[PDB]
Amino acid sequence: MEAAHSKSTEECLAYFGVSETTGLTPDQVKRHLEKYGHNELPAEEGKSLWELVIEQFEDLLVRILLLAACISFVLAWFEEGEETITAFVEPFVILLILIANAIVGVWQERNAENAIEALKEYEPEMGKVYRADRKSVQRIKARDIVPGDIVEVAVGDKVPADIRILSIKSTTLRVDQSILTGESVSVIKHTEPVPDPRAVNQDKKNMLFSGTNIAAGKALGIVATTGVSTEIGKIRDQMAATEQDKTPLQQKLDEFGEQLSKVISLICVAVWLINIGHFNDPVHGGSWIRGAIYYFKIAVALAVAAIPEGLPAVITTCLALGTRRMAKKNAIVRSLPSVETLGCTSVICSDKTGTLTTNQMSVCKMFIIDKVDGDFCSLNEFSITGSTYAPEGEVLKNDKPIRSGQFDGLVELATICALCNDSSLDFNETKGVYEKVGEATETALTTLVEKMNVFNTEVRNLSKVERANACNSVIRQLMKKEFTLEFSRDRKSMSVYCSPAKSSRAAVGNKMFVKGAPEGVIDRCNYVRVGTTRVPMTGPVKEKILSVIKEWGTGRDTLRCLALATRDTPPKREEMVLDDSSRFMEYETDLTFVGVVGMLDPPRKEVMGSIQLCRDAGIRVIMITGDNKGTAIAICRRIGIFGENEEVADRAYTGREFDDLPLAEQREACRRACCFARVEPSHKSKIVEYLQSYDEITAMTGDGVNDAPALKKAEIGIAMGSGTAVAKTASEMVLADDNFSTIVAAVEEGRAIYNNMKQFIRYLISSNVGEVVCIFLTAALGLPEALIPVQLLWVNLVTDGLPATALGFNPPDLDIMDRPPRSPKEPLISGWLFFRYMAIGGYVGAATVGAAAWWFMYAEDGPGVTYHQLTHFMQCTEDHPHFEGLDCEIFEAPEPMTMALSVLVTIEMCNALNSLSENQSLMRMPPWVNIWLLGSICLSMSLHFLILYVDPLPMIFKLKALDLTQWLMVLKISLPVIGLDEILKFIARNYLEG
Ligand SMILES: [Ca+2]
Numbered sequence: 005m006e007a008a009h010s011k012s013t014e015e016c017l018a019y020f021g022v023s024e025t026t027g028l029t030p031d032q033v034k035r036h037l038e039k040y041g042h043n044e045l046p047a048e049e050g051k052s053l054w055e056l057v058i059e060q061f062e063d064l065l066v067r068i069l070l071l072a073a074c075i076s077f078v079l080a081w082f083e084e085g086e087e088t089i090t091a092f093v094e095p096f097v098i099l100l101i102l103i104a105n106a107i108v109g110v111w112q113e114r115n116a117e118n119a120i121e122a123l124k125e126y127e128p129e130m131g132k133v134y135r136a137d138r139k140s141v142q143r144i145k146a147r148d149i150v151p152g153d154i155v156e157v158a159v160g161d162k163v164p165a166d167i168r169i170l171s172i173k174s175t176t177l178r179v180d181q182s183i184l185t186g187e188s189v190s191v192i193k194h195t196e197p198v199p200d201p202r203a204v205n206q207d208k209k210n211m212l213f214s215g216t217n218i219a220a221g222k223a224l225g226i227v228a229t230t231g232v233s234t235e236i237g238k239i240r241d242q243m244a245a246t247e248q249d250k251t252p253l254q255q256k257l258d259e260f261g262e263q264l265s266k267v268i269s270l271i272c273v274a275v276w277l278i279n280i281g282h283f284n285d286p287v288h289g290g291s292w293i294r295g296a297i298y299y300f301k302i303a304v305a306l307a308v309a310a311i312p313e314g315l316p317a318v319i320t321t322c323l324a325l326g327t328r329r330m331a332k333k334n335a336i337v338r339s340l341p342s343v344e345t346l347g348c349t350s351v352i353c354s355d356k357t358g359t360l361t362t363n364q365m366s367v368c369k370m371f372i373i374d375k376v377d378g379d380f381c382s383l384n385e386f387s388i389t390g391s392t393y394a395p396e397g398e399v400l401k402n403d404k405p406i407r408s409g410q411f412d413g414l415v416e417l418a419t420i421c422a423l424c425n426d427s428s429l430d431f432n433e434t435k436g437v438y439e440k441v442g443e444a445t446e447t448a449l450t451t452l453v454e455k456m457n458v459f460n461t462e463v464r465n466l467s468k469v470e471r472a473n474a475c476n477s478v479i480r481q482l483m484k485k486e487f488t489l490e491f492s493r494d495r496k497s498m499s500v501y502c503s504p505a506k507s508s509r510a511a512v513g514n515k516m517f518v519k520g521a522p523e524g525v526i527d528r529c530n531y532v533r534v535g536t537t538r539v540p541m542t543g544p545v546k547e548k549i550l551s552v553i554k555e556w557g558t559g560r561d562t563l564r565c566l567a568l569a570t571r572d573t574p575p576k577r578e579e580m581v582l583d584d585s586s587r588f589m590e591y592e593t594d595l596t597f598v599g600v601v602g603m604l605d606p607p608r609k610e611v612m613g614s615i616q617l618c619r620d621a622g623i624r625v626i627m628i629t630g631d632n633k634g635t636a637i638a639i640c641r642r643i644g645i646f647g648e649n650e651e652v653a654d655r656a657y658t659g660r661e662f663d664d665l666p667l668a669e670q671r672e673a674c675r676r677a678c679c680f681a682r683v684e685p686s687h688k689s690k691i692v693e694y695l696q697s698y699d700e701i702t703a704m705t706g707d708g709v710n711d712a713p714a715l716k717k718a719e720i721g722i723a724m725g726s727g728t729a730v731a732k733t734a735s736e737m738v739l740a741d742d743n744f745s746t747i748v749a750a751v752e753e754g755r756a757i758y759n760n761m762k763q764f765i766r767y768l769i770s771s772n773v774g775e776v777v778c779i780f781l782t783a784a785l786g787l788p789e790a791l792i793p794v795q796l797l798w799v800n801l802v803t804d805g806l807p808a809t810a811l812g813f814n815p816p817d818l819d820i821m822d823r824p825p826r827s828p829k830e831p832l833i834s835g836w837l838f839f840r841y842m843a844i845g846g847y848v849g850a851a852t853v854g855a856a857a858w859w860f861m862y863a864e865d866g867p868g869v870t871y872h873q874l875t876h877f878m879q880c881t882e883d884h885p886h887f888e889g890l891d892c893e894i895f896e897a898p899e900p901m902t903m904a905l906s907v908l909v910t911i912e913m914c915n916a917l918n919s920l921s922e923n924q925s926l927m928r929m930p931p932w933v934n935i936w937l938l939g940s941i942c943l944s945m946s947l948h949f950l951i952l953y954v955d956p957l958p959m960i961f962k963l964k965a966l967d968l969t970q971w972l973m974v975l976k977i978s979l980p981v982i983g984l985d986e987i988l989k990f991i992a993r994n995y996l997e998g
């Protein structure tokens with residue numbers, strides 16, 4: 005649709021043939037989407053520096069490698085010598101392996117695109133519309149909104165696509181077009197057409213331009229244009245693919261690739277140079293070319309082995325799957341470039357209500373008198389689980405569940421809470437959640453009796469709507485309330501006068517149930533209830549009761565307490581003044597103390613644990629609440645932000661106090677603050693500013709238009725899944741949960757994703773490092789070369805493939821939240837890490853050149869055994885009186901090479917087990933933790949076996965099956981690679997971090 009602003013509502017509806025009371029049909033949507041595409045901009049090409057300096061470079065290499073092989077394949081024809089056979093299939097074997105490499109490459113790239121695809125499911129559905137499907141509004145991804153269907157916009161929403169306003173349901177509809185036209189001053193709309201077709205957006209006040217925000221009202225409309233066809237998309241098209249920007253990690257990675265592209269090139273060009281003295285050997289026929297050709301094939305083959313392939317794919321895969329787990333836990337992170345930042349979070353500033361706290365008053369403790377003797381009493385104390393108004397949870401005594409019917413005192417406690425109460429519960433079928441009806445403080449009582457269920461009423465098989473007030477009803481049917489003595493500030497308590505239900509004894513069994521602040525109520529009690537009996541109140545008894553009420557309203561929980569009492573013999577109704585509350589205290593006298601309930605707005609699920617996790621991880625937690633300072637502090641001791649007894653009159657501030665401080669102090673307050681109470685919305689921005697001024701990577705929560713600035717400023721802006729869309733747009737994450745615990749879990753995944761990358765890099769670099777020195781360890785010394793081209797390619801295929809990919813699937817480390825947050829500034833590879841690389845490799849490199857030299861030096865039950873100089877072996881055909889019964893060509897035996905290659909392979913398969921964790925000993929993180937890794941180790945081992953025990957093969961790669969005795973020589977030479985690293989792990993896990 006075009007110029008919809010010019011046409012009328014009727015015209016626009018006719019354009020796509022749709023009534024605003026039915027909406028687009030399935031047939032229509034299918035076609036329109038096909039014809040108009042999705043509502044979004046095109047994804048820009050992703051040709052990184054790594055793809056050109058690494059990926060493209062290795063491709064070229066393997067081509068010229070095959071080319072070198074074909075050159076000599078042709079020269080092997082003009083060779084009047086004996087028609088060889090092994091070097092005759094070389095060109096074929098090379099092309100073959102290269103195919104295998106490709107198979108693995110596509111597999112990895114397919115995992116990545118598939119992992120990415122599985123993400124579209126969790127993308128936020130910011131867009132409501134009416135389609136012929138349902139006769140009720142429907143939610144859908146903004147990208148799935150095709151021009152034509154009917155959309156519904158409301159307050160605090162973001163315009164998904166360009167829409168022509170059809171009907172304004174509210175009295176007025178204001179919009180914020182600042183993002184495009186140029187002004188935050190909301191604009192008024194109408195549904196009339198704008199005659200001038202060539203008019204500016206600021207004049208098309210009958211259209212809702214995508215990317216704009218609703219300042220007020222509700223409206224119905226029809227989609228005119230989507231995607232880049234958008235009015236904003238045609239301004240955002242100037243930023244479409246014309247850009248130059250990369251995340252801090254991408255810059256480090258490219259810097260790494262570019263520097264690897266140099267190290268490999270050099271060391272390899274060096275291999276061909278330090279061997280020019282072998283271009284004329286007899287084993288090459290004495291050709292100054294065929295010899296240079298042979299080594300060129302090694303220098304390029306070593307390069308291929310060296311180069312760590314599959315990085316982009318593995319990283320993208322870890323990142324994509326990692327983000328899935330986040331969404332699986334309600335952490336919705338749209339921008340992948342954000343998880344990097346998320347992983348470095350060092351400060352989380354969180355609102356209290358609904359995020360740290362449930363905001364649903366709950367009774368968690370209660371007590372009744374147990375026994376009374378000698379004017380002293382013991383108490384029956386109980387705790388109740390469950391943290392919402394929902395009738396779910398149980399009563400416990402000494403942490404063991406008990407039935408409340410078992411204590412007659414509790415039956416009366418429940419009676420009183422069910423009757424002295426003007427509230428009720430209600431299950432909202434829409435939201436599928438229990439909600440309160442009336443004061444939260446009373447509903448906590450309603451919900452408590454539901455959990456108590458003193459008369460063991462059957463509810464397990466009841467409806468969610470019936471269950472809501474089930475138990476309260478049972479009680480209301482046994483007792484009839486005839487009137488209420490309204491709460492009075494004079495006495496701080498209230499009461500209900502009741503009588504037995506369906507009772508014919510009008511003047512028999514009448515009671516008054518009292519609830520109120522502890523002091524006044526306790527003071528008007530001359531009796532104490534014990535089970536169903538009553539004994540006089542005594543000082544000691546009154547003192548005990550009051551002390552536990554102190555402990556509760558003072559301890560780390562600061563529970564709000566209510567005393568519940570009963571006037572056993574209430575006055576006659578005829579003798580009660582019902583219009584003068586100042587007379588109520590008297591009517592509520594001569595009471596019998598029954599019990600005390602202690603309630604609070606409890607922490608959300610896992611919040612308290614998540615907070616300890618934060619502290620363990622060096623992540624500061626800052627609470628922002630509306631409560632007064634004194635209570636905010638209470639709430640912080642309660643959830644764990646502040647210790648039970650910890651001076652915090654320096655880490656908590658009200659906006660009043662904060663505003664009274666000068667710039668340097670305010671900033672100073674933020675480097676150490678843990679709590680901000682009664683604060684202004686403009687304060688969140690200052691807080692973020694000051695935090696950032698200390699290099700803290702900041703996460704800030706928000707849910708309204710007033711929070712957008714701060715969520716934008718913050719490195720990790722966190723919007724409530726239940727808040728306005730304006731906030732969500734301005735953020736890096738959305739809590740589908742609204743739960744603070746979900747933020748901490750997201751930070752954890754972020755750290756986890758980073759690690760897998762590092763472990764992935766360590767294995768590939770440490771291993772391949774040795775491969776390189778190995779070739780040099782024999783060249784520098786002078787020993788006989790232990791690896792030929794096809795052998796190098798074989799190691800590559802077997803060690804840089806599936807095994808490495810598998811590390812991408814490594815579980816979360818164990819000390820992941822026991823380390824401080826990573827600094828975006830620190831280098832990709834720390835000096836200690838580079839040492840850990842040059843150490844693990846330095847070994848495998850020698851453990852290989854040595855694995856073959858062993859066959860020649862201190863051989864065991866095997867030939868050769870000339871442990872003297874092998875250095876000048878190129879002189880065995882110059883002075884043979886040095887050997888004792890063996891042919892010089894013994895150095896050309898496939899025995900040695902079969903060892904070096906079998907060690908080089910099994911050892912790297914071992915080093916892969918060292919990469920299951922960064923610092924955790926295989927003892928703590930068993931190798932069977934990554935099943936995929938083990939499976940890859942098999943496949944790799946099987947293939948190496950097949951390449952040895954399948955007659956045709958062993959001749960191709962110049963090898964020979966080794967007996968059960970020669971294999972154990974590999975292990976005793978390979979297993980120590982674990983030991984070596986396992987030691988370094990001890991060094992770091994103990995002397996470096998701790
Ligand atoms: Ca490689």
Ligand SMILES: [Ca+2]
Nearest residue numbers: 771772803804
């Ligand atoms: Ca390797």
Ligand code: NA
Nearest residue numbers: 715716718721
């Ligand atoms: Na932000």
